[PDB]
Symmetry: D2
Subunit: 219 residues, 4 copies
């Protein structure tokens, strides 16, 4: 390594607006980048209790925390100490659309995250505004280059009650602050994000993520 330590701290601040509802959320966590694991304690500072499903926000709360094999270029760890930023569009199957971005920096053993999240057109009686989501199912992000920019497309899904699912398509564009960072070839990153615990109105949430990069079958 050198720039990134086996054990890193995580500082985050999110501000956003969904369907006209404003909110500010603080995060404090720790993680093991080389093992692709991280945990974070979230505290809603303004706008709580959120009138929408907390789950839509969780992936906004850093691909640095992903276990990359030696045969696959790790664009994220190679982006530090300078850092990088990402933008994302979350297209839900019922018309709800969100965009999010995060500017990631590093100071010592801590990653700093300036996050913004905006969402519109969620149906009033949909699972998001009615808070009927249970969790995101694990996923496999497809990483590839588009017009010189590392891009990740994902078939995501939120589990609802009675074993039904609510689909969302993700497209994330990753850009290192520093020019010249070597781009990886087409690959994958498996993810599993989960809310380990939370209070009744999700004003306090403990989040966790495990991610591993790979080259898919047959390797």
């Amino acid at each position: 390594m050198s720039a990134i330590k086996p054990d890193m701290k995580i500082n985050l601040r999110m501000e956003g607006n969904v369907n006209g509802h404003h909110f500010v959320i603080d995060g404090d966590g720790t993680g093991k980048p080389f093992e692709g694991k991280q945990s974070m304690d979230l505290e809603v500072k303004e706008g709580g209790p959120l009138p929408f499903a907390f789950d839509i926000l969780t992936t906004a709360f850093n691909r640095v925390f992903a276990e990359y094999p030696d045969h696959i270029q790790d664009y994220f760890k190679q982006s530090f100490p300078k850092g990088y930023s990402w933008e994302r569009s979350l297209t839900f199957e019922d018309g709800g659309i969100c965009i999010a971005r995060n500017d990631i920096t590093m100071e010592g053993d801590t990653f700093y995250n300036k996050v913004r999240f905006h969402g519109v057109n969620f149906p009033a009686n949909g699972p998001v505004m009615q808070k009927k989501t249970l969790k995101w199912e694990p996923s496999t992000e497809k990483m590839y280059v588009r017009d010189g920019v590392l891009t990740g497309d994902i078939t995501m899904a939120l589990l609802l009650e009675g074993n039904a699912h609510y689909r969302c398509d993700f497209r994330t564009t990753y850009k290192a602050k520093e020019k010249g960072v070597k781009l990886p070839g087409y690959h994958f990153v498996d993810h599993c994000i989960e809310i380990l615990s939370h209070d009744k109105d999700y004003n306090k949430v403990k989040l966790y993520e495990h991610a591993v990069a790979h080259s898919g079958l047959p390797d």
Copy 2:
């Protein structure tokens, strides 16, 4: 009318971020709500010169300015004095996605607009980041009710340098502040938006829009 006068003034302020670029734009205009015509002078206050096509922002700079026939319920004019707000998603064909919102209020003979505009995933060499757009073509917005909310869907297109077109799909949701405003039936609203004048880097722009509601064929 009653609450809305034949000649209204327009005050507007937009704050946004497209592809990581922050910006603030002020607007000052006038319009004839009953004739579906309005004009406005825009001035970039922060973030100038914008590194993207000014055209993506223009429709963000009020359906009250649309000529509604007596046989079609005018949800927008009926939303005042209290006012209304809208949310929109602009999905471009090359992956770029924007979401915008406008909270509209009225004090005297002036409409006030609190607008926000966010855009992500625009390709570096796409027409937006390369400023190769010329104008939005006229359009026809399809207005209908979805889950109790007035919704407008549009097949939009930007004429590009070179004579080709760049498609964008619009979905706007409109919500009156006052509960109980009668919802209209399925109808249409023709639009024509144009930048009348502008300086080199569009730090100063004069915008115009003409809109008329109708019931399509055969009527």
Copy 3:
């Protein structure tokens, strides 16, 4: 006109498969191309009674029948005597997707139509498989050139029972058989298609369409 007559006959045969159900439908009608009006009597020869809403098929049952103004190039009437063909994708909001095609020829005062229609992934309890549709709302097709081919994109909507709408996005590509047919500029074509009458299971249906091309506002 010269090639196309004010009064034309229409012969058509459609073969298709929706959600695994095969069918063949024959049609005979008449229309006035220069007035953009046509009518046709349809009869299900094989596959009756259809297990899905007949409405999804109706637009598959010729833009020659559209009233074009002198200032807009009429790509369709100019395609005969040789004729033309079109392909179309109908993407419904619930995942249902259909593609269709029509190879159009002419002999004397009659247009012949070789139509094919295929639909997949319609939810078992959706409005299509449950036959809960009432009609297509009138529309405005946006005509433009894409990669050298005349294309028509449309925000279509099926009015459903219960005062709700079911959206479908249309993309039709039109290609003249003979080279040198001048391509028109960006324009619109208003449409209004309706099933005038039908028997209980829609084995026999009378269809009608009125269409007018135009330049949109302010012209």
Copy 4:
């Protein structure tokens, strides 16, 4: 297993039309359902030489051939001896859209496949009509139930000459012929399909696929 043997034979016949081009392709192959592996020799009977990229057709040439772990319900193997059928929509990022379906039956140790493939709106200068595809990248299909039907959504990509990728979204619906077959819970199926060899104009092609079901991270 019982109904399905460790070694099975595959008999297939595809009939289709892409951008107006008709074709008939026969297939003969073998595979090991429990190992999730299969191979097949294809031969174009009518329509050769195909004017479009052969790669768009390959996934149309049976999830029975997928290694399913004991902890995940195998809807496919439990569908025999009666069999099952599937429908698929392939939405390419440039507007090209294809639908396909396969009715799969079994007699002895041989699977019989009645396949149909139709495609429309492929741009003349797109990679499909210009035959610039190299291969499909490996993928991970997300399996879940929508309206009582097993559904698979996939973020697919074709590697193109020149190192870039061309995206396509897959949605396949799977339906057992026999009522009752237990529906699985949300899961995944990794895929890797490759053309092992082919002659000049792809009139003869040797295809191969490897697939393995799994529960994602952390398991």
